[PDB]
Ligand binder design. Sequence first.
Ligand code: OGA
Ligand code: MG
Ligand code: NI
Ligand code: ZN
Length: 331
Amino acid sequence: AQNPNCNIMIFHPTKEEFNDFDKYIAYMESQGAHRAGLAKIIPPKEWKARETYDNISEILIATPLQQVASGRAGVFTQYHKKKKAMTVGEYRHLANSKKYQTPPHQNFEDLERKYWKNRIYNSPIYGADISGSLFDENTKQWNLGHLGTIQDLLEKECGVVIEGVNTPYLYFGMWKTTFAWHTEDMDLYSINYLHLGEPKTWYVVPPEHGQRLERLARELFPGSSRGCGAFLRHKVALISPTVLKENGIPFNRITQEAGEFMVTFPYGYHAGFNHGFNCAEAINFATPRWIDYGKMASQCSCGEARVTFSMDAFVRILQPERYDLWKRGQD
Ligand SMILES: O=C(O)CNC(=O)C(=O)O
Ligand SMILES: [Mg+2]
Ligand code: NI
Ligand SMILES: [Zn+2]
């Protein structure tokens, strides 16, 4: 078995290898990359996402989210308070202000220490989940707006044609902005490109160990667990690396820098934080190997998780027994 310790693997495809997206994902899996739940892909030196980032300031963040924490430094939840709209140029100036800017630090490990010590005492503002793309239309390789759709993959594997669409989302971050522990909708893959700015640190649990994280989460968030049998779908819970280590949970960590892609694999729990002002693009995708994960994915039916239009068909076709309860949670 390749990669039996489930380490995060880093790949350096050539420009030739960067042509065929599906083929390269399958290659990475042939080397065991998926066992980690996360991989890094450094694009060939010849590649670029677009020519410059000098003209993005007028993008609107219609609903910036203030991420307010509750709990203790290493075990907390966050809720998202909606703020007034602002442009990317206004958000960048806010990120760089004394109130929100990255503190002085020695290296990434020092900054990580400071994040986990102090995150809960601040409420950073995240421009998350903005439909759109920063890839140039002329970028033909790894253009996250031009991937094969999940509806086409389901149709190709299973023969059933379904409604729905699959488009990318932009994320504008600042110091301490946080993504809570989660797997993707329907345990899909994700791919994330860091277009510009400061790094993003990731934590990940191997898919074969995801139920160990779920059992810890139920212990640490006992009211939430009584409320919902899949409360991590709410995307609000944080657990620090120190607490994971104290509880024996297998995990790994890595820092993504501007110009790098990350892929999350089906049922790979992940969480993390931004180092300072940045912009990422991400989208879900599927392969043949996902279908079995989609069929087994947990679902939230309590009403909290509320998701896209296109998840309906996935539940309806892959999980017909669960469909009526899930759809009630949607309505
Ligand atoms: O960058 C973020 O805030 C969150 N991104 C993801 O969870 C992802 O790409 O799967
Ligand atoms: Mg603009
Ligand atoms: Ni994700
Ligand atoms: Zn729920």
